[PDB]
């Protein structure tokens, strides 16, 4: 099924389209929720036009904001499916992208697959507005576009300032990319330099001699990379880059691998420094270059880059069961808040990655600061770092951890490193979030996304059952308004059939918002007002009604069955009629022969199922006054009504639409047994 497309379950989206560019199992994989289930139970030009071309980074709606907000400049293709000046320019945008490796990221938006992200080009770099292109489609072009939008700077050097750079390199840990001109001759060409100069920001300086003007320094030896500390002397030329190549890529690679990897820091020098400060952390043991960047761009989010040598002291790798090379993100609190990072090592997303972290407050969980016997509220996320799946879920949590400051507590578990662990806590996929919150544990199976989660963690927080007071309950029941009725579940802790109650009494509540209030009432903590109200056996399910001259202050139920539809349906029970009972001629003379819309329940008053779903179809009657009329037939009284309906058993919905234009009556058959349904069902088609 993945090894039927012929890939691992570890594969991303985009190497599932290019495998499957080559069906039922795509639908499935490519689709993030009904990848989950399965987890553990044209096309030649208009299809993943820019998977097989990896310098174009194609964007998703989640991850957008974070990647071209990262720190480089970004350069966004907004596309289309059928567009043919997206297909027009698709050529362009390859060349472009692998002409600007190095000196800005190349991304594609498909507007197609998701729309409410936005054939257009854009500009954007952190800390701008987004700037929208409007030239013509040629490479040449587009370079200089981005190039204008490029910081660069290349100077010119005098003999006098070529050695005062050289001598002040060091001191200053930034060496120098010089090209040496002199006429009849090529040298590096005046726009390739500032290429490079963009390319090698903050990492090279860039400069140039004039071999003419600089007679006498010129004859000490074309572009040379110093290493800072190097010169043209015969004592330091051995470390002298000496390069020919006119080709502002070319010379880049050969800059970028040279360049000293991070700052390195004894097990002391750590520990000093990860008591208050952010740091970006390459742990190794005894990477594309391009990281070397890193130190530049994430200067303005005050985070440095360093790295540490494990085997120089293992006890700090291996209290932070750091087993392999990782890298990991401290945002100032000693080893205490951290994360790790998960997925490919590329410079964007380990730019992104650190911002949202130190800007977040998500933290990295192992079995001793695990938040056990802890009862405050505790939202966890057990995953595996290999699960594409996982890796997309952890940008959302940071998201929503932002909202949840001083709220709840946010933690990662990495159940490949702490199996014992997930264990223990049935983890049967990845991820798997959980809220802990009082002795209790809830698991979400919404949509991996920062809006929901947090909707599912306001539902917690104020749910459906209102948890009653003595005081609470007087406010609340007691002076209720008039038309507001509630239900109440009268329990103790210790009682069997209160645990048994419990999760129904949730299930149906959640079913009950804005029609009933529904509330519970803890008798053991409560003892003598719940003795005041007369309880005398666990549980005890009370309804208060609408208040009216009658004088019944409630209504016990004492029903057999206590499941959420036997509860629902008497709680319903007691809501007013909407409907009216029709006969064969109110029935003819005001649905056939009418000028409205009307849902008509035909039934017979023997039928368990016509009980059952009468206090429903009075749901539905309520919710649609004032657009749809609701009737009901007895089928018993009359069965020949309802045999020229074509009833054949009970409960039965019809449908009635007038329509003005045709002087006439469509006749429709409902299936759904849902109030709500129904409802939509029917205004649905009321518009068309």
């Known amino acids: 099924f993945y090894s039927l497309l012929g890939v691992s379950k570890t594969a991303s989206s985009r190497e599932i389209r290019q495998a499957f560019k080559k069906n039922r199992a795509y639908e499935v994989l490519k689709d993030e929720d009904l990848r989950k289930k399965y987890d553990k139970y044209y096309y030649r030009y208009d299809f993943g036009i820019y998977d097989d071309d990896p310098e174009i980074i194609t964007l998703e709606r989640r991850e957008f ?40 990221r190349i991304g594609a938006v498909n507007c197609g697959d998701d729309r409410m992200l936005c054939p257009s080009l854009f500009i954007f770099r952190s800390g701008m507005a ?27 050097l005098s003999t006098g300032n070529f050695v005062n750079a050289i001598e002040t390199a060091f001191a200053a840990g930034v060496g120098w990319l010089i090209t040496f001109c002199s006429k009849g001759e090529d040298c590096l060409t005046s726009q390739t330099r500032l290429r490079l100069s963009g390319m090698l920001d903050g990492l090279v300086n860039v400069g140039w001699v004039d071999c003419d003007a600089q007679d006498s320094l010129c004859k000490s030896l074309t572009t040379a990379y110093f290493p800072p500390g190097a010169t043209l002397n015969d004592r330091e030329k051995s470390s002298v880059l000496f390069l020919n190549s006119l ?71 291996s209290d932070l069961y750091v087993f392999q090379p990782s890298l990991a993100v401290f945002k100032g609190q000693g080893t205490k808040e951290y994360e790790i990072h998960h997925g490919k090592k590329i410079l964007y997303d380990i730019l992104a990655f650190a911002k949202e972290s130190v800007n977040s407050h998500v933290t990295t969980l192992g079995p001793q600061n695990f938040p056990a016997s802890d009862k405050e509220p505790w939202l966890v996320d057990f995953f595996a770092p290999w699960s594409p799946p996982s890796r997309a879920l952890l940008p959302e949590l940071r998201k929503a951890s932002t909202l949840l400051y001083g709220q709840l507590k946010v933690g990662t578990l990495d159940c490949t ?16 979030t959980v809220v802990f919150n009082q002795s209790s544990i809830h698991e979400y199976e919404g949509h991996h996304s920062a809006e929901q989660i947090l909707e599912f963690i306001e539902d917690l927080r104020n749910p459906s059952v209102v948890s009653l007071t003595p005081s609470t309950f007087n406010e609340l029941v007691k002076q209720r308004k008039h038309d507001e ?176 234009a045709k002087k006439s009556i469509w006749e429709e058959q409902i299936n759904s047994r849902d109030a709500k349904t129904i409802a939509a069902l029917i205004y649905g088609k009321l518009e068309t």
């Open 65 to 104: 904001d974070a990647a071209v907000n990262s720190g480089e400049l970004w350069f966004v293709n907004f596309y289309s499916p059928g567009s043919s000046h997206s297909h027009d320019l698709a050529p362009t945008w390859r060349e472009f992208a692998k002409e600007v490796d190095g000196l800005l």
């Open 130 to 156: 987004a700037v929208k292109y409007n030239g013509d489609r040629s490479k040449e072009s587009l370079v200089a576009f981005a190039m204008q939008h490029v910081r660069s700077t290349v100077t010119e």
């Open 247 to 317: 080709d502002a890529k070319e010379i880049y690679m050969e800059i970028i691998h040279n360049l000293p990897d991070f700052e390195l820091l004894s097990a002391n020098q750590l520990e000093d420094r990860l008591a208050h400060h952010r740091w970006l952390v390459f742990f190794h043991f005894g990477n594309d270059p391009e990281l070397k960047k890193l130190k530049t761009l994430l200067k303005n989010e005050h985070i440095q880059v360093v790295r540490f040598d494990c085997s120089s002291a293992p006890g700090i790798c």
């Open 417 to 432: 490193i702490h199996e014992g662990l997930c264990n223990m806590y049935n983890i049967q996929a990845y991820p798997t």
């Open 485 to 660: 009725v509630w239900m109440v579940d009268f329990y103790s802790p210790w009682s069997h059939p209160s645990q048994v109650l419990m999760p129904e009494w949730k299930r149906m509540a959640r079913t009950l918002t804005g029609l009933i209030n529904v509330g519970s009432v803890d008798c053991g903590q409560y003892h003598s007002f719940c003795t005041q109200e007369n309880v005398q056996r666990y549980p005890e399910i009370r309804f208060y009604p609408q208040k009216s001259s009658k004088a019944y202050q409630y209504h016990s139920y004492n029903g057999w069955n206590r499941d959420a539809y036997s509860l629902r349906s008497w709680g319903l029970g007691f809501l007013p009629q909407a409907s009216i009972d029709l006969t064969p001629q109110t029935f003819n003379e005001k649905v056939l022969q009418g000028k409205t819309h009307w849902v008509v329940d035909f039934y017979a008053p023997w039928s368990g199922p016509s009980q059952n779903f009468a206090p429903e179809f009075e749901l539905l009657a309520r919710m649609i006054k004032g657009k749809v009329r609701a009737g009901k037939v007895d089928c018993q009284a009359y069965p020949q009504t309802c045999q020229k309906a074509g009833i054949k058993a009970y409960p039965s919905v019809k449908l009635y639409q007038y329509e003005r």
